[PDB]
Amino acid sequence: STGSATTTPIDSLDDAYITPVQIGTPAQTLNLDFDTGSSDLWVFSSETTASEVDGQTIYTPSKSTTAKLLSGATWSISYGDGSSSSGDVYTDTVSVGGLTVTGQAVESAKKVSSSFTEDSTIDGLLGLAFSTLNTVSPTQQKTFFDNAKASLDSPVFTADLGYHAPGTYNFGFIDTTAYTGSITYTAVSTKQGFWEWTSTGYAVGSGTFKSTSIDGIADTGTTLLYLPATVVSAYWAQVSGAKSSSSVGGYVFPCSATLPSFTFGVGSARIVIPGDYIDFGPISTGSSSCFGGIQSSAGIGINIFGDVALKAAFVVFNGATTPTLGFASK
């Protein structure tokens, strides 16, 4: 089997992407944030504290003939940006782009933190990291991909995120029309539960390539590209007027600037992030100071190849017995 679903930016800055997901019988369609950096499928629901729901579409298990309470199971998650959610668990039928899993753990939120409430466009998350990170207790649950894997034509999913445009998540096949050239595959460590890999280096604009190992994660659920302070300093040094602002919380630059591209290495291959992908617009409405899309990972504890990087590529998440990651230009 295979699935194919379109993923759509939530706003004009590509702050995140939502993908429609059918849950239950009859189907309840919720727009979820597919997140290769976490492993819980959780939703706004009929159980969510009412004051914490503001425009989201909710899952109502009592209206699904296939929903079953997973007795005694609870979940609680905290993300790298400080947001969080928790609740209880149902199993139900979940379909993505034509691909159906029965008995999927659907984690129903009783509580969500303010940033979730304030984002009316995201109805929940669908985790696509390794199931070892799933927070359900006392019986850890599998991701949608893990549950689907055996039924897939090939044990893979791909992320093809658009720049200021829709893109695609495919399950079980590689669309050879969706990229140019060849796909370069690179080793993955699952030791931290992430799609963790090592980039072979970087270049800034038309500058020379610096060969250097950069360990990081391919994370569709993080907006920006977070890299070591040395790398980030080298990038922003090429933008006149750019500076790190502690009050804003990262590198800002004059909105009048033309940003250089940023290249990252995948083995001997190179993925080029156009300058425009690195512009996240005015820090506040009307400001001429703009927020940068490449930021330091210092104090995160991990480097993150988030959407800024991933949307420049066609990315294969290969869930074979020994997982790997593939990157192609497009």
From Swiss-Prot:
Keywords: Aspartyl protease, Disulfide bond, Hydrolase, Protease, Signal, Zymogen. One of its GO terms (molecular function) is aspartic-type endopeptidase activity. Its EC number is 3.4.23.22. Residues 17-328 form the Peptidase A1 domain. It catalyses: Hydrolysis of proteins with specificity similar to that of pepsin A, prefers hydrophobic residues at P1 and P1', but does not cleave 14-Ala-|-Leu-15 in the B chain of insulin or Z-Glu-Tyr. Clots milk. The active site is at D35, S199. Disulfide bonds join C255-C290. It comes from the Eukaryota. It is an enzyme of class 3 (hydrolase). GO terms for biological process: proteolysis. Belongs to the peptidase A1 family. This is Endothiapepsin. The lineage of its organism: Eukaryota, Fungi, Dikarya, Ascomycota, Pezizomycotina.
